[PDB]
Enzyme design. Sequence first.
Site, mmCIF file in Angstrom:
data_model
loop_
_atom_site.group_PDB
_atom_site.id
_atom_site.type_symbol
_atom_site.label_atom_id
_atom_site.label_comp_id
_atom_site.label_asym_id
_atom_site.label_seq_id
_atom_site.Cartn_x
_atom_site.Cartn_y
_atom_site.Cartn_z
ATOM 1 N N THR A 159 -44.061 60.689 42.824
ATOM 2 C CA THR A 159 -42.718 60.193 42.541
ATOM 3 C C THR A 159 -42.538 58.819 43.125
ATOM 4 O O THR A 159 -43.056 58.522 44.194
ATOM 5 C CB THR A 159 -41.633 61.115 43.127
ATOM 6 O OG1 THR A 159 -41.640 62.370 42.454
ATOM 7 C CG2 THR A 159 -40.274 60.505 43.019
HETATM 8 C C1 LIG Z 1 -40.026 71.424 37.664
HETATM 9 C C2 LIG Z 1 -40.826 72.712 37.858
HETATM 10 N N1 LIG Z 1 -42.246 72.653 37.509
HETATM 11 C C3 LIG Z 1 -42.613 73.298 36.276
HETATM 12 C C4 LIG Z 1 -42.976 74.763 36.542
HETATM 13 C C5 LIG Z 1 -43.210 72.037 38.365
HETATM 14 O O1 LIG Z 1 -44.354 72.043 38.011
HETATM 15 C C6 LIG Z 1 -42.747 71.381 39.704
HETATM 16 C C7 LIG Z 1 -43.700 71.370 40.968
HETATM 17 N N2 LIG Z 1 -43.639 72.614 41.657
HETATM 18 C C8 LIG Z 1 -44.696 73.127 42.456
HETATM 19 O O2 LIG Z 1 -45.740 72.481 42.610
HETATM 20 C C9 LIG Z 1 -44.497 74.480 43.118
HETATM 21 C C10 LIG Z 1 -43.628 74.444 44.349
HETATM 22 C C11 LIG Z 1 -43.819 75.581 45.238
HETATM 23 C C12 LIG Z 1 -45.086 75.910 45.703
HETATM 24 C C13 LIG Z 1 -45.314 76.994 46.521
HETATM 25 C C14 LIG Z 1 -44.257 77.794 46.904
HETATM 26 C C15 LIG Z 1 -42.986 77.487 46.441
HETATM 27 C C16 LIG Z 1 -42.774 76.400 45.613
HETATM 28 C C17 LIG Z 1 -43.193 70.240 41.900
HETATM 29 O O3 LIG Z 1 -42.258 70.467 42.667
HETATM 30 N N3 LIG Z 1 -43.798 68.988 41.869
HETATM 31 C C18 LIG Z 1 -43.355 67.908 42.678
HETATM 32 C C19 LIG Z 1 -44.424 67.493 43.689
HETATM 33 C C20 LIG Z 1 -44.657 68.554 44.703
HETATM 34 C C21 LIG Z 1 -45.538 69.616 44.456
HETATM 35 C C22 LIG Z 1 -45.745 70.631 45.367
HETATM 36 C C23 LIG Z 1 -45.032 70.602 46.567
HETATM 37 F F1 LIG Z 1 -45.212 71.583 47.461
HETATM 38 C C24 LIG Z 1 -44.128 69.570 46.842
HETATM 39 C C25 LIG Z 1 -43.953 68.561 45.896
HETATM 40 C C26 LIG Z 1 -42.903 66.747 41.800
HETATM 41 O O4 LIG Z 1 -43.582 66.387 40.856
HETATM 42 N N4 LIG Z 1 -41.651 66.214 42.051
HETATM 43 C C27 LIG Z 1 -41.024 65.194 41.345
HETATM 44 C C28 LIG Z 1 -39.602 65.457 40.975
HETATM 45 C C29 LIG Z 1 -38.596 64.778 41.585
HETATM 46 C C30 LIG Z 1 -37.230 64.976 41.275
HETATM 47 C C31 LIG Z 1 -36.854 65.834 40.311
HETATM 48 C C32 LIG Z 1 -37.866 66.582 39.633
HETATM 49 C C33 LIG Z 1 -37.487 67.525 38.640
HETATM 50 C C34 LIG Z 1 -38.449 68.246 38.001
HETATM 51 C C35 LIG Z 1 -39.802 68.025 38.318
HETATM 52 C C36 LIG Z 1 -40.168 67.141 39.288
HETATM 53 C C37 LIG Z 1 -39.234 66.390 39.991
#
Ligand SMILES: CCN(CC)C(=O)C[C@H](NC(=O)/C=C/c1ccccc1)C(=O)N[C@@H](Cc1ccc(F)cc1)C(=O)NCc1cccc2ccccc12
Lengths: 217, 215, 218, 217, 223, 222, 223, 222
Positions: free
Chosen positions: F1
């Site tokens: 991000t």
């Molecule tokens: C929107 C849902 N989605 C589809 C199923 C995803 O894949 C999102 C991804 N979730 C995960 O990777 C899972 C989170 C998790 C893991 C273990 C236990 C509990 C929770 C994510 O957050 N990614 C983050 C990065 C990240 C990953 C893992 C982690 F632990 C921490 C941060 C990101 O891209 N974040 C960017 C971001 C910012 C603002 C608004 C958004 C809205 C939607 C999607 C993304 C957004």
Amino acid sequence: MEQAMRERSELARKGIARAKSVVALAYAGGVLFVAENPSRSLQKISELYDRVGFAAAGKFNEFDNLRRGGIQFADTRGYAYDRRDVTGRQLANVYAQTLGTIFTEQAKPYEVELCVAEVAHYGETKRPELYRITYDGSIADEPHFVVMGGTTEPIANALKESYAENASLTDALRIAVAALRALGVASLEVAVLDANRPRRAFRRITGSALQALLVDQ
Amino acid sequence: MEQAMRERSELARKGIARAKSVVALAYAGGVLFVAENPSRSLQKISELYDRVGFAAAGKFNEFDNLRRGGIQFADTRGYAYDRRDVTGRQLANVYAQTLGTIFTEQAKPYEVELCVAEVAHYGETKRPELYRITYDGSIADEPHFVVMGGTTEPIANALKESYAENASLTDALRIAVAALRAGLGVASLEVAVLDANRPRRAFRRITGSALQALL
Amino acid sequence: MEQAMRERSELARKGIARAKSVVALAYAGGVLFVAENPSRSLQKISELYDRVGFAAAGKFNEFDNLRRGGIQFADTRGYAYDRRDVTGRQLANVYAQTLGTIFTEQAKPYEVELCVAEVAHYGETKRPELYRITYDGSIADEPHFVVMGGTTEPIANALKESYAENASLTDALRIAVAALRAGSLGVASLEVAVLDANRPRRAFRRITGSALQALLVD
Amino acid sequence: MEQAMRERSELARKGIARAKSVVALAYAGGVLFVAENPSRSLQKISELYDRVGFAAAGKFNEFDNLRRGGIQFADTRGYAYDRRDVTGRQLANVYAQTLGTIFTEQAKPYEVELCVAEVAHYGETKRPELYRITYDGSIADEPHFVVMGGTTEPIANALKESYAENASLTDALRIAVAALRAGTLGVASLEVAVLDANRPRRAFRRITGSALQALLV
Amino acid sequence: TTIVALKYPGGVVMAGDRRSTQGNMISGRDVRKVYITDDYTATGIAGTAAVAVEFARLYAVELEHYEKLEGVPLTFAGKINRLAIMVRGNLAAAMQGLLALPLLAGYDIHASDPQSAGRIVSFDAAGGWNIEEEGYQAVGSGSLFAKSSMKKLYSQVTDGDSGLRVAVEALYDAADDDSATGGPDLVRGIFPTAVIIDADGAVDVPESRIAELARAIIESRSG
Amino acid sequence: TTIVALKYPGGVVMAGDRRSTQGNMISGRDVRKVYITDDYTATGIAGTAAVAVEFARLYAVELEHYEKLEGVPLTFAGKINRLAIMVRGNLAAAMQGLLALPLLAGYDIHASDPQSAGRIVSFDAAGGWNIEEEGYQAVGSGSLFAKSSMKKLYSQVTDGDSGLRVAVEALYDAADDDSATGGPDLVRGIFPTAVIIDADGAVDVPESRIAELARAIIESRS
Amino acid sequence: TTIVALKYPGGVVMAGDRRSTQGNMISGRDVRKVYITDDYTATGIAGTAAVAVEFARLYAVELEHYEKLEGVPLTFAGKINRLAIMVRGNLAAAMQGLLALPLLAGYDIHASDPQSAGRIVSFDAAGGWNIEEEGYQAVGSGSLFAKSSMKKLYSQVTDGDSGLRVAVEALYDAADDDSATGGPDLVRGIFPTAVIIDADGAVDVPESRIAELARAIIESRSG
Amino acid sequence: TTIVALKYPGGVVMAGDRRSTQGNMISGRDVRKVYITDDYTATGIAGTAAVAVEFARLYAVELEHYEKLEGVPLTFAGKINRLAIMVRGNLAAAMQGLLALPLLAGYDIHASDPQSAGRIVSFDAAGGWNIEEEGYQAVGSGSLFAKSSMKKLYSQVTDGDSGLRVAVEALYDAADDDSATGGPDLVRGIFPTAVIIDADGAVDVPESRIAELARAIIESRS
Ligand SMILES: CCN(CC)C(=O)C[C@H](NC(=O)/C=C/c1ccccc1)C(=O)N[C@@H](Cc1ccc(F)cc1)C(=O)NCc1cccc2ccccc12
Ligand SMILES: CCN(CC)C(=O)C[C@H](NC(=O)/C=C/c1ccccc1)C(=O)N[C@@H](Cc1ccc(F)cc1)C(=O)NCc1cccc2ccccc12
Ligand SMILES: CCN(CC)C(=O)C[C@H](NC(=O)/C=C/c1ccccc1)C(=O)N[C@@H](Cc1ccc(F)cc1)C(=O)NCc1cccc2ccccc12
Ligand SMILES: CCN(CC)C(=O)C[C@H](NC(=O)/C=C/c1ccccc1)C(=O)N[C@@H](Cc1ccc(F)cc1)C(=O)NCc1cccc2ccccc12
């Protein structure tokens, strides 16, 4: 509502009128507390804090509960902040609040009348303050004396003619007892807030010493 | 009930009618509070917040509870949000709510009448606000002056005939003391101002030599 | 038991009768709220949610408590579900429930009468809804206008005779000010606001000062 | 006690009598609910569960609270056990217990009368059930129709002289609207809904607007 | 597990495989993973079976509970929010192994364009959601195989049946490359389950249509 | 991000990328990280998606809630305080992986000088905040690439249009050096989102204008 | 961070640097760390930014709260005690990395001798405090450099202007030997902040004066 | 730290050094570790400064609180018990490093023999106490050096002033062998503090008298 309140007010007022009287007055060395009390160990005049004293008229268990509550309040505040932050005005205020609450919400009103007094800290020049809190939370600021309990107007007027500012301890003591008759060590409780003590100003005058002070010229 | 509320109302009204009177009026420099108060150390007028002041008539212990409750409210709201966010209208509103609850649910109603006043922040141009809250939580927004306690009708008429906006401090105090008479030296008055020319905290007492200097 | 509710009812009825009057009526652009209000800053009309507005008559502290509770309810429901799922019908329903329990259980009944109004969402063609909720929780759905507080009958009759649903803001405002006069008056004594169905998101907007003057005369 | 109970009873009854009337009757397709209801959006007739419907007369805020408590009870029981285990008589029994408690312990009794109705499951042959629960928790099992609110005796007797089992939807609606008239009524003054035994799971269906008038002539 | 959902002109389709495992051992062959949760939505869940079925059941109860309490169904945004809250609510237990993720497929009756009213929403273990705006999505241990298959076959989706065929083919590819996803069992006559949703609501696809499509895929891959 | 915000004469601009990842896997391409939370404020969040969107949604609700309750909006300092309190309340959850950090950009209707009324506030995981007096700030995994790009481009910001381009180019650089920040996808037609805020309020920048800016930057590098 | 405080005849001075770090990375250049918390008192805090600002804010509110409630300000001892209780209340959090230590400088209107009415109180993470009777003190990662510089320069303190110069020079030294302490930035025009407190109250020192003292120090060390 | 207390004919004396440390660094030179807590009682504390000062302050308040409530002061046994209860109450924090141990010296107004009315009580981290029947005691990081010094000097203790000398000399020895106990600072004019208690109560020993005793010891050892 209205009659509940006038019935409570008259129960308390009659209770105080049946009790023995207390006078507190300012003199050159601080504040003098003189109470009619035959008891030997049950006191109606007490220390609250370093320079703050308490006297009460009325039902004993009631004003003793108020006395303990005031001591708890003061020690609690001085601990939380500092000793020098605890003032007579503060305690008079808490007593006013407390007696208002008691007077309106408890099963029976407290038949008490209280005096909270403060003298200067050591080496400071600050006129003593006297406060009178009545059974309903009414609070009054006074400069010379406070009369509580029994038939007040004879004693108050006797002091109104006989009072003079900055009187000596012995003079103030006999002015006070005179007004009270308007009596000896086995029948009086006497104590002083002595502005010339370094830390704790409260001192009782008891027994041989009190008779000495009563008789001396 | 109807007569339960009727005697609660009468107990309050007669309590306030027996109490000494307080006036607050807007003048050119802000808001002036003038109260009949024989006491040396028991205050009927107080700071609530930077530009917000408080004055009260009635039973001391009761309006002192209200004063502290307002200070607790204001300080908590400023801490939670920002100092600027605390307003006079806000405190007035909380006093309406609190006295309403008190008036219906407490063992005895509060024999109190309140004034909340607000001046501009330093260097800003905003007309002063005066709010009057009575024992049942009734709230009124007043443009020039507020009278509380005792026999109010005479004082209000005196102010209706002598009040002029943007008066000087001495002229306003003169008029205030006059209207209070219609119902008084240093030893019987408590005077303070919300001074719009002060940079942060507007509340300031006028006591002793400074006070008699202005009569 | 029966007498207690009779007295609560009469206390509240007289309280509201002593109060100044408030009108809400539908017009071509949404809903108009007009209240007799000397106060500069104390409000009898309020936004509740995007397309939902509030007006009240009676004791200020009480209808302000109800106003804050309605704001709390709507914001919580919109947060839990979605903003779209918050309706005027819902808020009116909660006010009926709440004033009912107040009317039976509180130390004193609330001397208030409420109006909850809703307009269409931007670009939807839905006629406004007006709901009246009284001191005991009685709730009524009214099609054209609602009158609350003070002497309501003169004002209501003026509204029956003079009312037009498709009026402009200016015409509706003057019809309303007329009816209010009929029951006992310009900028310094009125509080005016609208739920403007043409605003894209938040419909509530106040009309104050010079703008209001321009709408009262010409 | 007899003071209190008699006063609660008549407060509740007078309340219900001043309210607009509701009829529920069994017909060929299930159960038909017809209510005198001026409102565009506020409802006196509601779905409770798959095959169970609700109708009420009296104060809206009160019978709405009870309606919500019933939806809650049913959805909880079906979740805990199974949907098939939730029955019309269960909901009626809980309404009896709840209105009984309310009637004796609430600050003011509820001015409501309720009807809980159940139809057969899809493809099943079972008699419709109608239960009537009154303000004090009294519960009645009725076989053909239920009348609630306002002056119920004219309407009850009209139904008695006009009701036939398994009438068609059109016929049953006419009988209901007529009996309501006896105690001028078209779509804009009626709320109509049906428990439709021919629906595969959720039987509750409203009849509004064009369809209701089409039924009405 | 593999669950697929894809949008087609006028609707959405969701399909899931039938396998249940305990480690490497097959403990179920007829299991069901795609539930119709309301007249316009289907939910397919992957993860611990107990949690998955509890999710589907309790979600459907919540949607109807709201509908009956307030007289009107939730907006699709509201349905999405409630599922997200439920998922987040399970986060602690998922952290100790009771993990389940749903895939939501719906038809939004309030959308302007009826042909684009299909919605596909994915979720993570914390409740984060994404409305999938490229037409298809999958969840489960075969999700990436199914997604990569649908990437190549999606241009063929023009109506409900072509969409159903692509979905079944994606589950086929997932089963081919993932041992925890079960393919069509032609000996026992067990096939994926599917739900299709259009303006007329959500309906279960009959087993016969999926069998036909399945055999067509098999026959096409064998020659 | 990566989220960027910068002040320009008469307003402030905020832009953010569209990528969502799960480890190395790209799990989202059209995501939205910049929300208009108030008529005069925008918030962009980096971190765990569920937490990030919960922050934006509840913050916008909290601001509007205060407004309807008191008849007036919060001062900008009060807005900062409530965002800080929210971030702080999440610290326990953030320490076990539900971490989200916001960037706040606003236009202060009460500031004396209308041309410098733009505000940019950065936050840390414990609720500590800084009002940025140097004109720009960024948050997220590419924020230091974007800040170092804006450090060199900021002297070109003279109006809303130059500010918007500088913002988009800073996101371009962040995407260039950080694989968790998505650059403009010209194949799918997906571009960063932007909000611009001036005295007339906060408005979403239309997609087409950002697309123009992106294509111009790309070409400008070929 | 470094905060310094020292006594001069008739008052007290407190000054602090403007740098904020995250590890080695500089995250702030214009940070404020010294606040006027009361008409006669200033507090400067070192440590975690969120906690430091929380302390300053809540402390100033607690002082004004007591003053408005009781009609008089707390005695200096009372002020000390409340800051101490707040610090002790943060101990649990400080053990997990949210640590902040304050330094209190005030003027006691009730002291007997107005020339010795300055007060400097230092604190530890559990609330222990020391009233510093040797005239100066410092807190933060540069505190020992700043303290040892003031040990050599303190004898030049005869009034407020000399006191302020010694304060700014000690912060200069702390910045010279501590990378977490920022020196005067003559390119951007950012200099340490200072508060001076005497019988007429506490006032912010204008940036301009601190700039002039900084340029004087720099020139004194170049030639 | 070192605190010493010893009994003399007709009273008791207590003294403490003035050093405060943070690890190896000297953080204070004028610290006060011996307090008059009551008209007839003094407490000296070693350990964590915060806990030490809280112990003294709260102890003194508790004693006078009881005195004002009940009209009479606590018996010495009661004073001991309330101090013990306070220490025991701190055990949880002490196990996490906030450890402080007190030494109590008093004059029992009710003792039968005014010449033996001196009392010295030591405490451990759990609140266990010992009334020291052998006339002297010490606490802190130099306590063993001070105790072993007083072991050899105690026979010289015949009045309050010789007890005062021995106390100061024992603190001198402790400072000689423990870097956490500070000796007399003849450059800055800082010396141990002392309280002496006899039938007339507790009084602070004037600085000048301790200075003379300190200088006599110093010059006597050169
Ligand atoms: C929107 C849902 N989605 C589809 C199923 C995803 O894949 C999102 C991804 N979730 C995960 O990777 C899972 C989170 C998790 C893991 C273990 C236990 C509990 C929770 C994510 O957050 N990614 C983050 C990065 C990240 C990953 C893992 C982690 F632990 C921490 C941060 C990101 O891209 N974040 C960017 C971001 C910012 C603002 C608004 C958004 C809205 C939607 C999607 C993304 C957004
Ligand atoms: C239907 C009940 N059943 C008895 C025959 C099963 O075997 C299901 C199997 N339970 C288990 O494997 C037990 C795991 C466990 C639970 C609690 C504590 C400790 C261990 C399962 O979940 N399997 C998962 C995969 C899995 C395995 C281990 C693990 F820890 C987590 C997940 C699966 O296949 N899931 C696919 C699936 C999805 C939707 C609905 C279903 C319904 C039924 C069966 C399967 C379904
Ligand atoms: C103003 C907020 N901000 C904007 C992005 C920062 O970068 C500040 C920086 N935050 C961080 O380092 C993050 C703290 C954190 C990390 C994980 C979990 C919980 C909390 C900081 O506090 N730095 C400290 C030093 C520090 C850092 C990390 C740590 F763990 C302990 C201490 C500092 O400079 N402190 C100096 C300082 C003192 C007084 C007032 C100030 C006001 C503003 C900024 C700084 C101030
Ligand atoms: C007066 C405050 N101050 C000025 C900043 C200090 O430096 C005091 C020093 N605090 C510390 O060393 C900090 C302890 C701590 C560390 C992490 C979390 C929580 C607490 C201290 O107590 N030192 C002890 C020895 C010590 C050190 C660390 C430890 F864990 C335990 C004990 C001491 O000298 N104690 C002697 C002493 C006895 C009676 C009254 C006093 C009053 C003031 C100063 C000292 C006094």
